[PDB]
Write a protein that binds this DNA or RNA. Structure first.
Ligand code: NA
Length: 95
DNA sequence: AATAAGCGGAAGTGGG
DNA sequence: TCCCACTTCCGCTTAT
């Protein structure tokens, strides 16, 4: 099963949910979710995973928080805004 | 208050 | 056994 950070990077590449998530500074890997449309994106994550319950943005963000220590995704000091690591960005484009 | 978001411990579930 | 990679639940805090 795909990892959450990869699901998000792939969405940003495809633009399929551009009203729910977007790059802020793609060269730096900063991205942001829509206040009003993030739940639809969270629902898609849960369905992709086949989880028992309906996924919510809150649960998805709780998972994102666990990447802060290992570094794949860090929370930036703006609402609903995060930053991928250089490792995630480089390996992603190469893959 | 109403609404929204942030913080994050802890217990539960997957798939090795 | 026991970690992976989250998921789910819960109580608390901050927004300015
Ligand atoms: Na605010």
């Amino acid at each position: 099963k795909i990892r959450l950070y990869q699901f998000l990077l792939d969405l940003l590449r495809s633009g399929d949910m551009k009203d729910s998530i977007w790059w802020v500074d793609k060269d730096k890997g900063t991205f942001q979710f829509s206040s009003k449309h993030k739940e639809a994106l969270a629902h898609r994550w849960g369905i992709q995973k086949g989880n028992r319950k309906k996924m919510t943005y809150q649960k998805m963000a709780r998972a994102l928080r666990n990447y802060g220590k290992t570094g794949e995704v860090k929370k930036v000091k703006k609402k609903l805004t995060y930053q991928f690591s250089g490792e995630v960005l480089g390996r992603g484009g190469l893959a």
